[model samples]
Target: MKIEVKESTMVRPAQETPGRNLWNSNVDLVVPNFHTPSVYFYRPTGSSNFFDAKVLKDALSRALVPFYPMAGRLKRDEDGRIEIECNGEGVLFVEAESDGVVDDFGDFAPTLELRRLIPAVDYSQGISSYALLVLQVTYFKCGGVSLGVGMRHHAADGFSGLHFINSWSDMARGLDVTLPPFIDRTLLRARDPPQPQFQHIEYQPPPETAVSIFKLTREQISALKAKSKEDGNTISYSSYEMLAGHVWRCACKARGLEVDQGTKLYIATDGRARLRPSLPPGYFGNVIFTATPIAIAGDLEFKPVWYAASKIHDALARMDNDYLRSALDYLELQPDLKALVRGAHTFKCPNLGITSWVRLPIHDADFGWGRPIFMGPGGIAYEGLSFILPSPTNDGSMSVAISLQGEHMKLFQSFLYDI
Candidate 1:
């Protein structure tokens, strides 16, 4: 089936915040450095079914009615501090592709990421979407049937995007609609004089450290289930932590450091909930926090999984409102900590370190189609070792992307295959 490109335009809000001074300090650092816009494509396999691109486009367009404001738009102040405007469009581009049997395995194939874009979809997905605000849909070649989506992080987080996508699916399937409420911008008030109370320093040149990535295959997932049964912890650790621990061990071994090497692991947690006590369920935007857990990497180097899980549990537990306040107060009191936090991305500690969690709201963004099958932040100009945890499906499974020094990519890849 051939899909063709359709109309594209920005979806803006009726009112604007003039001279609002809403630009976030973290956002300013992340914008140019992190590259907010991202793209991913999903191809339907021939075994299941094929979707008409036009029909999908129409469905998405209708589904986008509620989130039109977040679709295509960028915000800018007189000083050029960037913000986001809700104005993005979805388009379908016609393209040809050879037919093939769909592979049932959930493994992502390289073919999906390499397709060329049709003009209409390309320009609309890139230009128009970049202009208005949040997300865009570009339908192009996917074996016999496929679609691609591009999105920005300013307007909605993953959860909000997921909500939007599910709503779109309901609309496409002609089901009852109960859209989530949209929180206005005014409610997400910024704390006066953004100050750092804790230190998260960036690395200067980074270290010759090793890195790794791992995934849970069907069998391994079952093994984890069995292990949980034995441990009686009932609470199953996520694939990210399970794998991160293993990688941490490998890195320690390579460096000949003991597992209990007294290291620290840091994870970036969205502070939105902690920042505002009564945040509405639909509160969007970039409110996030960070958690750091100190442990001995060398002590558990051999038992990577246990240590990794403990580290994760501890780090997450520390993200309470009090933790947020403490972090803020620490940074505020020690103004010098800003240099350390900024330097952390580049500098290595005298201790082993890991940054495993990145809370981006992909599920909450819906321009059309259902929530994305996979989404993540990219680009690593950072000074330290870090990874991003991205939702791989509408369900709760997560996919992680790790960034390490170029030399460590090989080690990380090998570690993943070993797992």
Candidate 2:
């Protein structure tokens, strides 16, 4: 689709916000320094005033007041840690018009075409020189629209990302900021002695990847639930565990792995309620921990799906307060946090990482026109990675978007559906 750019400008916080260097927690420092890209598609209201770029920009100005970190630039502090320079520099906003319609995005998996809908980041200029949040709005000739976002991962995780947009949409609909961000990141500060207790994984280079989307209906998931006439199968696994186990095992089967080779699965464990005293719901930063579950290819492939699900459940079951603090302390001991950050994973039989956005309220952002018809990552940046998204309009259904090496995807598909 050809897109014509009309304007590209900064929309600073509508009100004056404080200027200071907001320190990032060790958890934040280990996060990859890149903007997470996502897109939202909205259909036409069939009105002359369906979507006005000026109105959006105006609403954005107010939205940034309380959530002022989005209107800032990233810079390294005296300690050489990445922190936000809350200078009220504003977020990058672009206006464009496309000849294509909303339907142009078929299947809506993270693909090359979806990249055009997102505002690009110039990582070459050094981290400090760019806006933490960048956005774009493209108008379809058919009167539909797509809203694209690239928010820095260092500043926000999936939960905060959705929270920010939901609040922005609230302002666009003439409502006040209902949930202001609690940005005092020191709450997650490392211990005074900084004692690290656990072992973390090392990094690896990525491989050539192919992306695809797979859908699971409500009945299909029920079929999974019903396949459990196994040892001690007493509703012990939810669809998350069942699905994760299935995919990881499928990757192993399709990967042509040696019997003795080791396989790893990285599952996201939330820290919102696990931390002591429990961080308030409005805490606006990364509260996610990567919990790794390991297995020998022989066991993963030879065993039933329940066996794999148990591995995942056990890994998550251990991510309590002690483990979270240990992981935090673990990062504090690293000489350079950037080196400790895991690179884009290579899903080639040995490793797999899965993320679930199915429960997040991503599709509820109504910027005046209506709720989005579609919302998902602009594109998968890492191969061997997968994202679980709620089916756009279908309740009780979900879709998984995976980026694996080219030839293996064909085999993976067959293995995933083999009852």
Best by TM-score: 2
Q: Candidate 1 regions off by >4 Å?
A: 1-49, 78-80, 86-106, 109-129, 132-143, 175-177, 185-197, 200-214, 217-243, 251-266, 270-276, 294-304, 325-419
lDDT of 2 by residue, 1-419 (tens): 78888899899988899998888997777777764588999989887877788888999999999999888888988877788898999999999999888887888879767888877778788887888888899999888898998888898887897888899899999999787888888999989798866665522223267888888888887787666656666756888888888888998898889999988887776688899989977898888888888899999888888889889888888888988888888777778777666675434457888888877898989988889988988888877788888877867788888888888999998988787
TM-score for each prediction? Answer: 0.60, 0.95
Cα deviation at 118, candidate 2, in Å, is: 0.8
Model 2 misplaced stretches (Cα beyond 4 Å): 202-208, 231-235, 345-348
lDDT of 1 at 330: 45
* Pairs with backbone N, CA or C atoms under 3 Å apart (clashes), candidate 2: none
Worst 10 residues of 2 by lDDT: 199-208
Candidate 1 deviation (Cα RMSD): 7.2
The superposed Cα distance between candidate 1 and the true structure at residue 278, in angstroms, equals 3.7
